[PDB]
């Protein structure tokens, strides 16, 4: 379970990066609504 945890920790970190990227994209799109 040690390998699995180490790998899953890295997966979760990557998913957090994906989440930040998607939120920033939604923000970019909302900025485009105004201008």
């Amino acid at each position: 379970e040690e390998e699995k945890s180490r790998l899953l920790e890295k997966e979760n970190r990557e998913l957090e990066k994906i989440i930040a990227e998607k939120e920033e994209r939604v923000s970019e799109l909302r900025h485009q609504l105004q201008s």
């Binding site: 699995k4 945890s5 899953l8 998913l15 989440i19 939120e23 485009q32």
Partner: protein
């Protein structure tokens, strides 16, 4: 008891993984809805 700790750690990371994946599903929905609003 470090063995039980490792098992708990994995279960917790699995819970976290699901939380993050559910957030992604929500964000994909937001991306589509705002894209439709903008276009």
């Amino acid at each position: 008891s470090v063995n039980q700790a490792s098992t708990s750690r994995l279960e917790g990371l699995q819970s976290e993984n699901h939380h993050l994946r559910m957030k992604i599903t929500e964000l994909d929905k937001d991306l589509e809805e705002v894209t439709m609003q903008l276009q």
